[PDB]
Design a binder for these strands. Structure first.
Lengths: 139, 145, 159, 294, 169
RNA sequence: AAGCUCGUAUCAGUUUUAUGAGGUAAAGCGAAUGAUUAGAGGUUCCGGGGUCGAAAUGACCUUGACCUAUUCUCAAACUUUAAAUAUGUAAGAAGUCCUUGUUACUUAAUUGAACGUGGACAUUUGAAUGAAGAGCUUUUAGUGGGCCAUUUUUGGUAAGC
RNA sequence: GAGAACAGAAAUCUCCAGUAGAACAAAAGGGUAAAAGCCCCCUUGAUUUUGAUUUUCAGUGUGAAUACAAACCAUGAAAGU
RNA sequence: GGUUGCGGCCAUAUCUACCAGAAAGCACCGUUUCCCGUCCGAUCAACUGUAGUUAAGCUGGUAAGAGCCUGACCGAGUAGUGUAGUGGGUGACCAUACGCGAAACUCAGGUGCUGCAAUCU
């Protein structure tokens, strides 16, 4: 990713955390199968079918470069992983048409890298202070 | 296994009539892999009862060869001919319990002409034998009778 | 080694219901119990005295005794190939009238009554329950309901 | 106060029973007054409920039902003008009278009134009303103090004394009547009688009279107005018992306007709330108001 | 608006955090007795702390609580000692306030060298009428938002009688 | 194995209807506990290192800690929710209703509680299906190394473990 | 959290918020808020007799436990416990 | 209809903020001889109902309010599951047949009901 397109042209996210601990029993005469409960050996991620492993956001310009990162990446994992390109704006959600309708409306406020969505639910007062752009004369 | 027995089906190719209601429908569900069933026609019932109708009379299994035998056990409910019997079966109706029980389990042969599928133990919907094949029970029973 | 205390395995069974901890409301102490009543046993783990052992959780028996603070209950328990008769002294916090004996008594009345109006009309009754029956013919109309025809749908990813 | 409650805090929060929230009912006590021995079946435990407001004494014989408590009879110190008392309507003496009244009142309606006189005499000596032989056991009742503190000399046990002397069986003990000496472990019945007839108010009236015409005049503005001289308090109460025993029956107030008429005014000072549509309109308006930064 | 709800001292609490048990603490307590005209109450240490020299459940300090007109007189005496000047800290967010004096002889009080000299905390809590609502056994409740004491309100109360100075921020 | 007492009965490795119990699967984590990625904003007027008058009991810093609203991801010994399969009881003559007898229990109380007399109600008498008969007693053999398959499942890299 | 001489991160003193985030000998789990927690007052029901019952079960023993009966006591205004 | 006493169910009842409340009630509120309890008549006890006030309590209203409740072919007949095959697939796993069927989500509506006794323009 970085060399072909730059230290900065993408956001790569490992979407899977290796919470499960593996054990080795571990044979040092020999003791046996007597009391064989293992010691902790390593960690792993328990992954499902259709479960996402990596996600990447870039600019449309960079699609091909991106796919090749993730294609180069497979060769490091057991199993079959597919590269799917998504209808969805970046890491948000909402297909780009529905995200766009929103951003061009004021309903979206930039948070820390991610984003905050105008609700029709809290107090009128402080949703007005939170999303001024949404209810304003404005262009 | 219990259901098969409570429905008097403790031998391969033996067959009986069941009145359909919820309390019996859930029985047929439990049993579905082990039976073939459907909606019998008058024709089929007429011939099942004529050819292989036997009655239960002090345990013993007795061929219905004269109407006197039917009247002597089923007369008390109306039903004094073999056609009185067929009618209480096909129309279901008020003494169906008692009429139907008097009829011993029908002992059919294997079907003459075959099962028409390569494998019986799948569902009729899946290529054949077992489960409710609906109207198509007549064709099957006729070849077994 | 292994462990089989009296309240073994009971962490979720004797726990109180979510947001329902604390004092037990007085209704529980106002129910009256009679010999021959049918109660359902269900432990209240906030009351440690007069408490059913966990085998009897979820079981229903008959009252055979009434005492200052408890009823005695008869449960039939299967041990081996045979039921043994068991009697329990449960405090009242752990017991509750069986609601189905109530529908039943209600119906027995309903039944007596149906029988009455039938005789004082001199007609047939029919008092026993039939199970759900097959369903009789209908004519469905199409006025305002011309059938909408559907087809299967193409695969698609939403991710 | 920036002590804001997280939505999680509120969400898992389990509320006390309503009457607990509102500081009125002790449920630990209630379980123990109300609950009946299981093999006495539907025999009601009956409580003598006694409460004090700032101006009235409530006295109720209550019993329990899943669908709510049930009152057998009630008596209120506010009734006491009917029988001669017009002041000190929450003092010990009235507590005693009210307990007497409730006693004679309920067991009138019970049939039990002639058999079981009570005391009639009154020197305030310790005694329970004990059962006739070859006749009905007395009507039995258990003091419900509510949330009141058990202090030795409390008003609440005045109502107990009147009601016990009234012929009710109300189990109790001397050690909270005024006149109990903790050193002596005895009860000076002289003192207790004095309270029954108001001695403690009466002696004060005299002391104050002689030592402060002015303060005596505010605290006893009433007695002055009615020419009630102080050393006739005992008569007032003594004659009040007579009256009460003579005629405990309940006569309800004479009642200007009907429940209906009351209804049509009496909280059509009640704010009526909006329909989900008016609310919407208010919503849409408020925005148009608020929209535009500042 | 303002009729009932005036604002006043609930109580005055004089505290001498003595620091040890024995003669010195019994001596300090005498100061509170001979001043409040009440009999004072002794506090025990919540836990041991080696470097302060106190053992858990050892009596370390005495205080005494005062109310009505007498507490108001002792308050005045204290203020005198600090020349009617307190600081804008001093006042709690919830409407109370306090200060301390070194040497108690600075408010009346002879010298009696068998007693000695003690400094002391002064804490005065403010309420209104109707506090009983939150203090009584039956139907314990909370005082309304309006009603209920605040740092602003009670600083201004205190400037306004006492003719005093708050200070700093 | 021997029978015995009876004879359509109440039976039943089953359904239905009614009414209970349960905390697994799944689900959840901008819900409690515990874990975990990322920024954002605001706090410290009470942890700290500077530069600005050594100045600092004074400012703007970046750095913790903490707070708010978000964000990605998890649990056999976490959870609000919560299945499917399994599971308890009931569906009446030992029932129903009316009358009023007994007691030393119980009640303020012939009031309740139990148990009864006398009177009334048998076509479907109180869902389904079946019953090859139901109930009961004594006595005694062998056995007390088990193994396999689908499914659930634990230890183990695994195993014809 | 906001406040008070010596007083400090930490001594004692107010006030506010506070569903239990505490405490309940001990492992853990359950349970508890005018309490089952904390402070105080009075106490020996940790007593007497001998049966029934639940768990483990052979429906033997043992340990433990539940509800009564008949005594004698404790406490409390009392219901009660 | 209001209000009080005793309640049933125990948030549609709780939380936060702001309003409003006639009448009676309830309350706050005045007092310290007496019984009684405090470091402190604050609480607890007693006394007057007299001097005062609806400020608070309390009741009700407001709120694209936090929570709680209810509904829905909202999601979803999805996840999971009982039963079937000499079904697919190297396997991981998956599809079909007879059935059962969620949770989160979304949106809509709602914010105490009620028993006994007393009292009130």
């Amino acid at each position: 990713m970085t060399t072909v397109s730059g230290r900065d042209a993408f956001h790569l996210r490992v979407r899977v955390h290796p919470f499960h601990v593996l054990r080795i029993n571990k044979m040092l005469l020999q003791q046996g199968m007597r009391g064989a409960w293992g010691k902790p050996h390593g960690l792993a991620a328990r992954v499902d079918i259709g479960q996402i492993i990596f996600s990447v956001r870039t600019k449309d310009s960079n699609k091909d470069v991106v796919v090749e990162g993730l294609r180069r990446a497979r060769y490091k994992f057991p199993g079959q992983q597919k590269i799917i390109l998504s209808k969805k704006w970046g890491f948000t959600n909402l297909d780009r048409p529905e995200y766009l309708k929103k951003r061009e409306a004021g309903e979206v406020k930039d948070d820390g890298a991610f984003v905050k969505f105008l609700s029709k639910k809290g107090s009128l007062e402080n949703n007005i202070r939170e999303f001024p752009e949404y209810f304003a004369a404005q262009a | 296994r219990k259901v098969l027995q409570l429905l008097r089906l403790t031998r391969i190719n033996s067959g009986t009539f069941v009145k359909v209601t919820k309390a019996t429908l859930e029985l047929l569900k439990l049993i579905e892999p082990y039976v073939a069933y459907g909606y019998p026609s008058y024709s089929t019932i007429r011939q099942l009862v004529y050819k292989r109708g036997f009655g239960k009379i002090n345990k013993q299994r007795v061929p219905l060869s004269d109407n006197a035998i039917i009247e002597a056990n089923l007369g008390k409910y109306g039903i004094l001919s073999i056609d009185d019997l067929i009618h209480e079966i096909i129309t279901v109706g008020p003494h169906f319990k008692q009429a139907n029980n008097f009829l011993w389990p029908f002992k059919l042969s294997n079907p003459s002409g075959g099962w028409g599928v390569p494998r019986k133990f799948k569902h009729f919907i899946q290529g054949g034998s077992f489960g409710n094949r609906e109207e198509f029970i007549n064709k099957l029973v006729k070849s077994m009778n | 080694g292994k462990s089989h205390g009296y309240r073994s395995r009971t962490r979720y069974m004797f726990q109180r219901d979510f947001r329902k901890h604390g004092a037990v409301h007085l209704s529980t102490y106002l129910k009256v119990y009679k010999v021959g009543d049918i109660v359902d046993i269900k432990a209240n783990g906030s009351i440690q005295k007069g408490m059913p052992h966990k085998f009897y959780q979820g079981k229903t028996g008959v009252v055979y005794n009434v005492t200052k603070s408890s009823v005695g209950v008869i449960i039939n328990k299967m041990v081996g190939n045979r039921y043994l008769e068991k009697r329990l002294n449960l405090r009242v916090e752990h017991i509750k009238h069986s609601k189905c004996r109530q529908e039943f008594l209600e119906r027995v009345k309903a039944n007596a009554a149906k029988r009455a109006e039938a005789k004082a009309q001199g007609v047939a009754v029919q008092l026993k329950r039939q199970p759900a029956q097959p369903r009789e013919s209908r004519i469905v109309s199409t006025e305002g309901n011309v059938p909408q025809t559907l087809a299967p749908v193409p695969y698609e990813t939403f991710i | 106060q920036k002590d804001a409650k997280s939505s999680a805090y509120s969400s898992r929060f389990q509320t006390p029973f309503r009457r607990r929230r509102e500081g009125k009912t002790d449920y630990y006590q209630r379980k123990r007054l109300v609950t009946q021995h299981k093999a006495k079946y539907n025999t009601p435990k009956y409580r003598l409920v006694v409460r004090f407001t700032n101006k009235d004494i409530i006295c109720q014989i209550i019993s329990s039902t899943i669908t709510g408590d049930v009152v057998l009879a009630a008596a209120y110190s506010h009734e006491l003008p009917r029988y001669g008392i017009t002041h000190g309507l929450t003092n010990w003496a009235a507590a005693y009278a009210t307990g007497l009244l409730i006693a004679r009142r309920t067991l009138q309606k019970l049939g039990l009134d002639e058999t079981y006189k009570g005391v009639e005499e009154v020197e305030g000596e310790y005694e329970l009303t004990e059962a006739v032989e070859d006749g009905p056991r007395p009507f039995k009742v258990f003091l419900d103090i509510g949330l009141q503190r058990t202090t030795t000399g409390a008003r609440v046990f005045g109502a107990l004394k009147g009601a016990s002397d009234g012929g009710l069986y109300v189990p109790h003990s001397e050690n909270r009547f005024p006149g109990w000496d903790f050193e002596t472990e005895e009860i000076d019945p002289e003192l207790l009688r004095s309270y029954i007839f108001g001695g403690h108010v009466s002696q004060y009236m005299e002391e104050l009279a002689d030592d402060d015409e002015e303060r005596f005049s505010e605290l006893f503005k009433g007695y002055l107005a009615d020419d009630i001289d102080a050393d006739s308090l005992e008569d007032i109460y003594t004659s009040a018992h007579e009256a009460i025993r003579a005629d405990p029956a309940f006569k309800p107030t004479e009642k200007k306007f009907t429940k209906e008429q009351y209804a049509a005014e009496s909280k059509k000072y009640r704010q009526t709330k909006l329909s989900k549509e008016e609310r919407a309109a208010r919503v849409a308006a408020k925005i148009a108001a608020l929209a535009g930064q500042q | 608006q303002n009729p009932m709800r005036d604002l006043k001292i609930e109580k005055l609490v004089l505290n001498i955090s003595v620091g040890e048990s024995g003669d010195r603490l019994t001596r300090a307590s005498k100061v509170l007795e001979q001043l409040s005209g009440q009999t004072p109450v002794q506090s025990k240490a919540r836990y041991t702390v080696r470097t302060f020299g106190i053992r858990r459940n050892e009596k370390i300090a005495v205080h005494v609580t005062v109310r009505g007109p007498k507490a108001e007189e002792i308050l005045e005496r204290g203020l005198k000692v600090k020349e009617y000047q307190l600081r804008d800290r001093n006042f709690s967010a919830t409407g109370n306030f306090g200060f301390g004096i070194d040497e108690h002889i600075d408010l009346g009080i002879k010298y009696d060298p068998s007693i000695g000299i003690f400094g002391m905390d002064f804490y005065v809590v403010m309420n209104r009428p109707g506090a009983r609502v939150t203090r009584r056994k039956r139907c314990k409740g909370t005082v309304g938002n309006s009603h209920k004491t605040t740092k602003e309100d009670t600083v201004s109360w205190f400037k306004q009688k006492y003719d005093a100075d708050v200070l700093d921020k």
